[PDB]
Write a protein that binds this ligand. Structure first.
Ligand SMILES: Nc1ncnc2c1ncn2[C@@H]1O[C@H](COP(=O)(O)O)[C@@H](O)[C@H]1O
Ligand SMILES: Nc1ncnc2c1ncn2[C@@H]1O[C@H](COP(=O)(O)O)[C@@H](O)[C@H]1O
Lengths: 234, 231
């Protein structure tokens, strides 16, 4: 009998969940030396492929802010990525709709640069933080590990502004934050070339030579993601 | 069947001083998982993967990174779409850390030290104090070219000063794309293949590793391209 895909020895790795961050994804991938990994849903049906090339394009190619918006990046992803902790959470805002801005300026001229719904990265100055609150940023990120005073926190409570503290400095926090993005915003979703447990190895061969992908997700006869295969397993 | 017989990617190798940005553009546009790096005589120096680029962006705490890597100013200018208003022509290296000068005048001394790379806005006072602190590189944001006065101060004190159209957040994201490929690429245990090898023998070689591509050399040890399992 000719060989089928299940007859091979492949990478039986658990697919990623679509809500996990680029950062969580890269750690999982790097630690298995994977060039790409499947994404699946709660029922373990194929949603996507995620390549290191996708991650990289996301860093190397961005004019676009509201990126946090378009990706619907969640607060948990930002806290994890910035090793941060929340002092107040607007529990009814799931999306941060504006752009990321380093509040470099002094208090009076912040309005020329920072709008309602923006994500502002500020330092340990109460004056700055109060003005960012009055401007109704969707998220205040305070740097240097300098947890804000109770007065500022109560003002965020009053106005329902999400406020968090990271130990990182503004530069570092600016480099990190894009690692927060969920995989599902970055992964490939269309024209997925998948392979069945029961396809003949000789058929898969043909199929694989048609494209140049590092890996192909393997799906069982019940349509569930079982792992992935590469040219190397042939 | 000889390796040369086969059909391959005939891609020109990267020069080792090229930035990650420029390198990614060439790869992205030729759809390359990896690419050879070679010297000015076309002898093999290394292999550069997108994994090596990504790892550089994800896993980095290490400032002085600009220093460790001898990142050049032309690389920073390109990446930041910047213009130089003064240049210290006797300094190839920027040795300190990158710091966003978000702070106020009198407080800068606590966070910024001599040799640092300061990202600043359109404030003469701040720019002047940064100069007085002897930063290696003052980067000015928002397309806000510094005043003649600030320019002459940089002149007398030999401080490199440049202006980028980008804001501080974006400058901070971009700057790391400046590093030269040779700081990032794999250098050792390079697995290469001769134009004049048995295709059956490159098959055994290849199965012992999981690399996307293997660079191809002729019998003069010149890099002619690369091949993959695909081929
Ligand atoms: N098996 C696949 N089917 C369809 N698209 C893929 C597959 N694997 C990767 N991709 C996508 O195709 C591009 C190149 O993938 P890769 O070869 O894995 O670097 C990236 O956008 C991937 O997300
Ligand atoms: N042909 C090769 N020989 C030796 N090392 C390589 C080769 N290609 C890539 N590498 C390195 O091995 C690691 C994985 O590369 P890749 O499989 O191309 O993502 C990266 O650090 C590469 O720089």
């Amino acid at each position: 009998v000719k060989l089928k895909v299940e007859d091979l020895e492949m990478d039986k790795i658990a697919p990623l969940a679509p809500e996990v961050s680029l950062k969580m994804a890269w750690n999982i991938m790097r630690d298995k030396n994977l060039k790409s990994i499947p994404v699946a849903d709660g029922n373990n049906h194929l949603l996507g492929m995620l390549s290191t090339s996708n991650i990289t394009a996301t860093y190397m190619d961005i004019w676009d802010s509201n990126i946090l918006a378009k990706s619907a990046t969640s607060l948990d992803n930002i806290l994890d990525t910035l090793s941060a902790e929340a002092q107040n959470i607007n529990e009814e805002r799931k999306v941060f709709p504006g752009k990321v801005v380093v509040a470099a300026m002094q208090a009076e001229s912040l309005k020329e640069f920072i709008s309602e719904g923006d994500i502002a990265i500020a330092g340990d100055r109460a004056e700055i933080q109060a003005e960012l609150i009055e401007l109704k940023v969707s998220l205040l990120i305070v740097t240097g590990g300098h947890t804000p005073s109770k007065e500022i926190i109560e003002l965020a409570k009053k106005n329902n502004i999400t406020v968090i503290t990271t130990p990182h400095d503004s530069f570092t926090a600016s480099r990190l934050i894009v690692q927060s993005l969920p995989v599902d915003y970055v992964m490939t979703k269309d024209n997925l070339v998948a392979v069945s447990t029961d396809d003949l190895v000789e058929d898969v061969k043909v199929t694989m030579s048609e494209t140049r992908y590092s890996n192909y997700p393997v799906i069982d006869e019940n349509n569930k993601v079982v792992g992935s295969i590469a040219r190397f397993h042939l």
